[PDB]
């Protein structure tokens, strides 16, 4: 049974809420995919998760407790304020915004208007639809924000509509990277 | 758990046999960098980032070194409970709207990976490609499995087939995930 | 990174008050310690301190992590003739390196 | 504990010298320091485990090997007078700022 593989995982997490004014530190010791031990800056100590971590529990606490508790400050708080502020929490990527009509046009005929908002960062954004400068609220839907994996996100928002003479629909995008909203029109 | 931001500063993954290891830094789900254990070098996904912050690979090495250690004290303590293969799930989507002739990137997302060992490749017209293709490290999941993305730059064509070949032990046959413009 | 510490040699009488200065110059958030090198032996751990304001102690010796003045000054009640040894101040970064950097050391001579 | 060998080495310029260190602490970390006046301890080499050779702060003129767990050796290819000093070996469990356990040293002089 050589095809009998193995693996352990060490997964640290620094949860930041409102700057560093509030941090929760979590350390997960994993075997294959079972979590057997863990540290929680909220529980205040190491605790055995499964039966497997029953051994380590006492040894990890007696030894590394004070050292692990401190990481909330030496790793978490420190990194956030020293490395994150000038990189992550400063990256602002304006999105591209296009509008494509779902089916072929046809006056007075049920159709959709898709607004593609791609390549932006961070994720928090807001896309609106307007019809003759009057906001369309009914028949507006969207996809699940997509994490492209290359430090950018994308999303598509639909507007079921009915193309009529002289109508000008508008996609409205507001983002932390925009001094003012990006507005794209679609003319009937 | 909830918060405005999350940072995994030092995710270690030691896999035996093969002494296969990964060491990464993750922030809000994206990948900052990984320590190339062979070159003893810190590989940043974003260039402009390494010009404002840095990390010493030795830290990677030291912790990987501990992964090796612990993955043994455990592999034994668990009476050797081998790990359980899973079946990965691929999903192919564009990066931006596919305009004909207009450059673009094909993104293949693969979730539910376990263990983190896998071959992802592209195929243009059932024929394979190996170029202009790049992939991310193994991102962790809440259920302790992983996911990874592979990228294939290309030019939108009204006569081009594409596939995301995904090979993994927990997959009898290499799964393919079609896509067309 | 560097750990700069009090001169080279100091001399005290028994019962005197010990104070050995140590300032450090680090890039991250380092752990600080003190080791002792008794005559004819190798250095040895005394106590550590992982974060600002934390105090470390051992065998009557103590030092408080002061991030503000980047100091980790060693202090003791009243020294004893057997305290004569070389005191090393040191640090380790928060990078996981496991690299322990040291200072020049300070020779302490407690007169009988 | 930790033990070194030899505990006194008189050597000649050029000669190839080697120091040996053993430990029953079972730590995965082992280091090679040298003590000089005005310099204190300075790290030359250390290892994260068997097969590990990490260059410390003052590597030049040195080489090392961690053939197993309990043994880490340092080698001066072409010994020189500037390499005259007391060498101390140490082991650590690799637990963030791992406290270090030192051997009694090896007094070496290059005439």
């Amino acid at each position: 049974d050589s095809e009998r593989h193995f693996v352990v995982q060490f997964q640290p997490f620094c949860y930041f809420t409102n700057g560093t004014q509030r941090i929760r530190y979590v350390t997960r010791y994993i075997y294959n995919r079972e979590e057997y031990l863990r540290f929680d800056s909220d529980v205040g100590e190491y605790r055995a998760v499964t039966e497997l971590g029953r051994p380590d529990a006492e040894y990890y606490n007696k030894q590394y407790l004070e050292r692990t508790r401190a990481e909330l400050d030496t790793v978490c708080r420190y990194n956030y304020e020293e490395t994150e502020v000038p990189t992550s929490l400063r990256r602002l990527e304006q999105p591209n915004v296009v509008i494509s009509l779902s089916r072929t046009e046809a006056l007075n005929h049920h159709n959709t208007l898709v607004c593609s908002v791609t390549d932006f960062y961070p994720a928090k954004i807001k896309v609106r639809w307007f019809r003759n400068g009057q906001e369309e609220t009914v028949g507006v839907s969207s996809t699940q924000l997509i994490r492209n994996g290359d430090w950018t996100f994308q999303v598509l928002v639909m507007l079921e509509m009915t193309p009529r003479r002289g109508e000008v629909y508008t996609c409205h995008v507001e983002h932390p990277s925009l001094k003012s909203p990006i507005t794209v029109e679609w003319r009937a | 758990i909830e918060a405005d931001h999350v940072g995994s500063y030092g995710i270690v993954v030691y896999q035996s046999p093969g002494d296969i290891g990964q060491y990464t830094f993750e922030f809000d789900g994206d990948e900052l960098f990984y320590v190339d254990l062979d070159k003893k070098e810190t590989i940043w996904m974003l260039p402009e980032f390494a010009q404002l912050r840095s990390f010493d690979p030795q830290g990677g090495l030291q912790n990987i070194a501990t992964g090796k250690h612990n993955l043994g004290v455990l592999t034994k303590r668990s009476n050797s409970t081998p790990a359980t293969n899973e079946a990965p799930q691929a999903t192919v989507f564009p990066k931006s709207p596919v305009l004909l002739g207009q450059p673009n990137t094909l993104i293949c997302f693969v979730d539910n990976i376990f263990p983190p060992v896998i071959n992802i490749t592209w195929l243009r017209n059932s024929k394979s490609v190996a170029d202009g293709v790049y992939e991310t490290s193994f991102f962790v999941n809440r259920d302790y499995s992983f996911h990874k993305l592979s990228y294939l730059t290309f030019i939108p064509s009204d006569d081009d087939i594409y596939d995301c070949k995904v090979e993994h032990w927990g997959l009898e046959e290499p799964v393919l995930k079609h896509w067309e413009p | 990174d560097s750990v700069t510490q009090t001169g080279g040699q100091v001399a005290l009488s028994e019962e005197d008050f010990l104070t050995i200065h140590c300032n450090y110059s680090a890039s991250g958030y380092p752990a600080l310690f003190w080791y002792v090198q008794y005559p004819g032996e190798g250095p040895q751990f005394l106590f550590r301190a992982s974060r600002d304001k934390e105090k470390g102690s051992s065998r009557g010796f103590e030092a408080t992590y002061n991030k503000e003045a980047t100091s980790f000054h060693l202090q003791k009640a009243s020294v004893q003739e057997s305290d004569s040894a070389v005191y090393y101040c040191a640090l380790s970064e928060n990078y996981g390196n496991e690299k322990i950097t040291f200072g020049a050391g300070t020779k302490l001579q407690v007169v009988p | 504990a930790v033990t070194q060998s030899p505990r006194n080495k008189v050597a000649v310029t050029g000669e190839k010298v080697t120091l040996s260190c053993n430990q029953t602490n079972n730590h995965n970390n082992m280091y090679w320091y040298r003590q000089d006046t005005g310099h204190g301890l300075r790290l030359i080499y250390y290892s994260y485990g068997a097969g590990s050779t990490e260059k410390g702060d003052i590597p030049d003129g040195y080489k090392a090997s961690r053939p197993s767990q309990e043994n880490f050796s340092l080698t001066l290819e072409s010994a020189t007078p500037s390499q005259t000093s007391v060498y101390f070996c140490a082991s650590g469990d690799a637990s963030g700022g791992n406290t270090l356990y030192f051997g009694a040293g090896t007094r070496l002089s290059v005439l």
Binding site: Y59 | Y9, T66 | - | -
Partner: peptide, 11 residues
């Protein structure tokens, strides 16, 4: 220079 969480050893 950023730091990292120490993957503690066991036994």
């Amino acid at each position: 220079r950023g730091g990292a969480s120490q993957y503690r050893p066991s036994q």
